[PDB]
Amino acid sequence: QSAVEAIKQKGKLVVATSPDYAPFEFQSLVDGKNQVVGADIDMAQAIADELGVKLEILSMSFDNVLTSLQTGKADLAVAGISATDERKEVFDFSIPYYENKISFLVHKADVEKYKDLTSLESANIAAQKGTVPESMVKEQLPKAQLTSLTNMGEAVNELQAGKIDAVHMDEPVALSYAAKNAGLAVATVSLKMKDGDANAVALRKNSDDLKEVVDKVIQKLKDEGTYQSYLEKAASLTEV
Ligand SMILES: NC(=[NH2+])NCCC[C@H](N)C(=O)O
């Protein structure tokens, strides 16, 4: 019943994530080898360090991250996860570690074009399966052709190929794609967003002892501006 003691005993903290989402988590050539990096990984490492155990990152597609936590394949899920009311019915969440807006990534040549929701309504929109940006499009733009894709990298590949006109995603991720790729930009139009709902670490219910440790680490990061600093450092890394 003791999450903290169980983690200490096995000597590792297992964190489920989906590394398709720079600057939160993504793949980068460190040395040498492909490695999962990003602000969420630095935070997960801080939590593991506080507990005195090794960090083990378990990579999968986003739409299976919460399920893997729920069924015991990981101790925590950290994947830029919005702490929604719906999700709070099933999981407990840490205090928020970062709060951001939600944006559309488009072609630079189309920034003047997609100025309102009516214009997006007639566009081919992509979003990630099992996500808040996906739900928002379904709710607020029901008349749009929405393509739901498992992997965010594939959504962006479809945007680059011209099969998709706009991809809905967390703003820091859109900014990163725009900053690292010539033909891309963040649209000036955005959907109405669910008040509250910041990123938080997900845990199984009745994990109060582990939640306290996670909250302590997160509060210290926010107090020192460290999570912001982690995001800025991640932005200087190249993705695979
Ligand atoms: N690693 C990822 N692909 N994360 C996607 C997160 C999307 C959104 N913030 C959500 O919780 O639904």
GROMACS .gro file of N, CA and C and ligand atoms in nm, residues 17-22 24-25 40 60-63 65-66 78-84 87 100 102 128-135 150-152 169-170 173 198-199, ligand 1:
model
  135
   17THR      N    1   0.567   0.809  -2.055
   17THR     CA    2   0.565   0.934  -2.131
   17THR      C    3   0.552   0.905  -2.281
   18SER      N    4   0.532   1.010  -2.359
   18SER     CA    5   0.521   1.000  -2.504
   18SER      C    6   0.616   1.102  -2.566
   19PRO      N    7   0.736   1.056  -2.607
   19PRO     CA    8   0.840   1.150  -2.652
   19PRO      C    9   0.823   1.201  -2.795
   20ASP      N   10   0.709   1.266  -2.822
   20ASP     CA   11   0.682   1.327  -2.953
   20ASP      C   12   0.641   1.472  -2.936
   21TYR      N   13   0.698   1.539  -2.836
   21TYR     CA   14   0.636   1.663  -2.788
   21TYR      C   15   0.739   1.761  -2.731
   22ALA      N   16   0.840   1.796  -2.810
   22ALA     CA   17   0.938   1.896  -2.769
   22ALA      C   18   0.868   2.030  -2.744
   24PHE      N   19   0.864   1.940  -2.407
   24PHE     CA   20   0.828   1.863  -2.288
   24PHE      C   21   0.901   1.729  -2.281
   25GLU      N   22   0.889   1.651  -2.388
   25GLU     CA   23   0.967   1.527  -2.403
   25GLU      C   24   0.984   1.494  -2.551
   40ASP      N   25   1.004   1.775  -1.905
   40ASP     CA   26   0.935   1.674  -1.824
   40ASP      C   27   1.031   1.567  -1.773
   60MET      N   28   0.584   0.548  -2.497
   60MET     CA   29   0.473   0.489  -2.572
   60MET      C   30   0.397   0.602  -2.640
   61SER      N   31   0.289   0.571  -2.710
   61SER     CA   32   0.210   0.679  -2.769
   61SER      C   33   0.126   0.744  -2.661
   62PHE      N   34   0.091   0.870  -2.682
   62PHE     CA   35   0.022   0.943  -2.577
   62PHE      C   36  -0.107   0.876  -2.531
   63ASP      N   37  -0.185   0.825  -2.626
   63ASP     CA   38  -0.317   0.770  -2.594
   63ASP      C   39  -0.314   0.644  -2.507
   65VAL      N   40  -0.065   0.640  -2.242
   65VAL     CA   41   0.012   0.681  -2.125
   65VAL      C   42  -0.069   0.667  -1.996
   66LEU      N   43  -0.189   0.724  -1.993
   66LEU     CA   44  -0.271   0.713  -1.872
   66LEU      C   45  -0.315   0.569  -1.843
   78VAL      N   46   0.403   1.135  -1.689
   78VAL     CA   47   0.446   1.275  -1.707
   78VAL      C   48   0.462   1.294  -1.856
   79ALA      N   49   0.371   1.370  -1.916
   79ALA     CA   50   0.370   1.381  -2.062
   79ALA      C   51   0.294   1.505  -2.107
   80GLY      N   52   0.323   1.618  -2.041
   80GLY     CA   53   0.251   1.741  -2.071
   80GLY      C   54   0.101   1.720  -2.054
   81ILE      N   55   0.065   1.652  -1.946
   81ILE     CA   56  -0.072   1.605  -1.928
   81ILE      C   57  -0.159   1.710  -1.861
   82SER      N   58  -0.262   1.755  -1.932
   82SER     CA   59  -0.361   1.848  -1.875
   82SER      C   60  -0.440   1.784  -1.761
   83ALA      N   61  -0.443   1.848  -1.645
   83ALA     CA   62  -0.517   1.793  -1.530
   83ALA      C   63  -0.666   1.829  -1.539
   84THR      N   64  -0.738   1.760  -1.627
   84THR     CA   65  -0.880   1.790  -1.649
   84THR      C   66  -0.971   1.731  -1.542
   87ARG      N   67  -1.028   1.365  -1.614
   87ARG     CA   68  -0.917   1.279  -1.576
   87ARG      C   69  -0.904   1.267  -1.426
  100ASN      N   70   0.008   2.653  -1.980
  100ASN     CA   71   0.028   2.718  -2.110
  100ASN      C   72  -0.100   2.719  -2.194
  102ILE      N   73  -0.308   2.684  -2.582
  102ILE     CA   74  -0.316   2.585  -2.687
  102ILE      C   75  -0.328   2.659  -2.821
  128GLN      N   76  -0.405   1.524  -3.181
  128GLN     CA   77  -0.353   1.397  -3.131
  128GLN      C   78  -0.462   1.317  -3.060
  129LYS      N   79  -0.472   1.188  -3.090
  129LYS     CA   80  -0.572   1.101  -3.028
  129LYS      C   81  -0.558   1.102  -2.878
  130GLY      N   82  -0.673   1.113  -2.810
  130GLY     CA   83  -0.679   1.104  -2.665
  130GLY      C   84  -0.639   1.231  -2.592
  131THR      N   85  -0.642   1.346  -2.661
  131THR     CA   86  -0.591   1.470  -2.601
  131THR      C   87  -0.694   1.582  -2.586
  132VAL      N   88  -0.660   1.679  -2.502
  132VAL     CA   89  -0.738   1.801  -2.487
  132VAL      C   90  -0.749   1.883  -2.617
  133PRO      N   91  -0.636   1.908  -2.687
  133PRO     CA   92  -0.650   1.979  -2.815
  133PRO      C   93  -0.742   1.908  -2.915
  134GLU      N   94  -0.745   1.775  -2.911
  134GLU     CA   95  -0.838   1.699  -2.995
  134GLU      C   96  -0.982   1.724  -2.954
  135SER      N   97  -1.008   1.713  -2.824
  135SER     CA   98  -1.143   1.732  -2.770
  135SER      C   99  -1.195   1.871  -2.802
  150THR      N  100  -0.228   0.931  -3.390
  150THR     CA  101  -0.169   0.882  -3.265
  150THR      C  102  -0.044   0.961  -3.223
  151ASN      N  103   0.045   0.987  -3.318
  151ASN     CA  104   0.177   1.048  -3.294
  151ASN      C  105   0.180   1.193  -3.342
  152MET      N  106   0.228   1.285  -3.260
  152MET     CA  107   0.232   1.427  -3.299
  152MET      C  108   0.325   1.453  -3.417
  169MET      N  109  -0.226   2.191  -3.088
  169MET     CA  110  -0.129   2.135  -2.992
  169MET      C  111  -0.098   2.235  -2.882
  170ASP      N  112  -0.033   2.190  -2.775
  170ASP     CA  113   0.009   2.283  -2.670
  170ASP      C  114   0.102   2.389  -2.728
  173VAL      N  115   0.490   2.355  -2.779
  173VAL     CA  116   0.525   2.259  -2.883
  173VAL      C  117   0.515   2.322  -3.022
  198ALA      N  118  -0.385   2.297  -1.621
  198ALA     CA  119  -0.244   2.316  -1.641
  198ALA      C  120  -0.185   2.177  -1.651
  199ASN      N  121  -0.059   2.166  -1.690
  199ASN     CA  122   0.011   2.037  -1.688
  199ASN      C  123   0.039   1.990  -1.546
  241LIG     N1  124   0.359   1.387  -2.495
  241LIG     C1  125   0.244   1.427  -2.551
  241LIG     N2  126   0.218   1.396  -2.677
  241LIG     N3  127   0.157   1.498  -2.481
  241LIG     C2  128   0.029   1.548  -2.532
  241LIG     C3  129  -0.046   1.632  -2.427
  241LIG     C4  130  -0.169   1.699  -2.486
  241LIG     C5  131  -0.261   1.767  -2.384
  241LIG     N4  132  -0.185   1.858  -2.297
  241LIG     C6  133  -0.335   1.662  -2.303
  241LIG     O1  134  -0.304   1.636  -2.186
  241LIG     O2  135  -0.429   1.601  -2.355
   0.00000   0.00000   0.00000
